Design a protein around this ligand. Structure first.
Ligand SMILES: O=C(O)c1ccc2c(c1)nc(Nc1cccc(Cl)c1)c1ccncc12
Length: 340
């Protein structure tokens, strides 16, 4: 039973593979749905079962995802490295199904449910540290995630308490535990594997990707910089869907693009006389000037720990991928010193 768009039709209480009993729907996307199940072959443990649509290209994509997930499990037998656990996978009549550990809301959905009020700095610290650990493990194992964003980082448990923010005169939802996992390995790429030309969701996309200079592990670090900023202020760093505007936003926030990258890119339509072809005195240019500013201007406190966070973000947003902070270096940053 498939619907017109290729989704599996199910009802609460259905069993799949005489094993997975459907309890509720956790979420839905273009690729399929994730459903909460009781796994009766695992002592009744609750799992998140991803049911991919009956679509040949999605099926093929899921097989690659499964291979990355299998590599993760293999290299992490004690489940230490903060990437989601796949417990099982099967082909269910064309629908690829992947059984995952059951987690809570994504960091995006939690942020959204909290009216986009940012995470406090001590939570940003722990969340950022875990994000760096999880992706370092990937990078250590010749993998690049390529699609890191707040939607793909879930809280292990998103139970919260109401806290009052005196500065903002509002109630805030405060997650009880900041434990997180990186999910969605559908785009993850091994060093030796065919690389897609364009990767990452627009807002999180590295300049070497936009400029088609080649990409590898460092493009994840750029995304991470963008994510950490979004946790701290609550809005996306690069709110644009246009390459040239995106590049102009980078220049306003971070300063001019290095000449070597400009010289090397085939994307010469974006450039004039060796610099970005952007007129700040147009309305397009006015928009960028009014809707973003130099990176450090986003600090909400002059206290040292806030400056330390921005030191880290700034290093992660180094234009040159070979000069960019590696995650091994990031884990040693002074910003993380306050963490246990
Ligand atoms: O892809 C994975 O690796 C992946 C792995 C695990 C979960 C997931 C995606 N998505 C969840 N929720 C969710 C929320 C919104 C939309 C959609 Cl489709 C799914 C979810 C919830 C609870 N526990 C584990 C997961």
């Amino acid at each position: 039973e498939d619907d017109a768009e290729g989704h599996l039709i199910y009802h609460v209480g259905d069993w799949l593979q005489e094993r997975y009993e459907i309890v509720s729907t956790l979420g839905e996307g273009t690729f399929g749905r994730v459903v909460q199940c009781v796994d009766h072959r695992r002592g009744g443990a609750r799992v998140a079962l991803k049911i991919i649509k009956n679509v040949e290209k999605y099926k093929e994509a899921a097989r690659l995802e499964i291979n990355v997930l299998e590599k993760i499990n293999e290299k992490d037998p004690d489940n230490k490295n903060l990437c989601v656990q796949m417990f099982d996978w099967f082909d269910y009549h064309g629908h690829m199904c992947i059984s995952f550990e059951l987690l809570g809301l994504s960091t995006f959905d939690f942020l959204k449910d909290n009216n986009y009020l940012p995470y406090p700095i001590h939570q940003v610290r722990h969340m950022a540290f875990q994000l760096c650990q999880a992706v370092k493990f990937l990078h250590d194992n010749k993998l690049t995630h390529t699609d890191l964003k707040p939607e793909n980082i879930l809280f292990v448990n998103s139970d919260y308490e109401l806290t009052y923010n005196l500065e903002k005169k509002r109630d805030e939802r405060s997650v009880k535990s900041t434990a997180v996992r990186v999910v969605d390995f559908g785009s993850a790429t091994f060093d030796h594997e065919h690389h897609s030309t364009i990767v990452s969701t627009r807002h999180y996309r590295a300049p070497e990707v936009i400029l088609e200079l080649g990409w590898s592990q460092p493009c994840d670090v750029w995304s991470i910089g963008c994510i950490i900023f979004e946790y701290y202020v609550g809005f996306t760093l690069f709110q644009t869907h246009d390459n040239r505007e995106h590049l102009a936003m980078m220049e306003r926030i971070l300063g001019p693009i290095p000449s070597r990258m400009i010289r090397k890119t085939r994307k010469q339509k974006y450039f004039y006389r060796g610099r970005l072809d952007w007129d700040e005195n147009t309305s397009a240019g006015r928009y960028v000037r009014e809707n973003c500013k130099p990176l450090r201007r986003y600090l909400t406190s002059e206290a040292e720990e806030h400056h330390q966070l921005f030191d880290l973000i700034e290093s992660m947003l180094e234009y040159e991928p070979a000069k960019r902070l590696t995650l091994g270096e990031a884990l040693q940053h002074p910003f993380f010193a306050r963490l246990r």
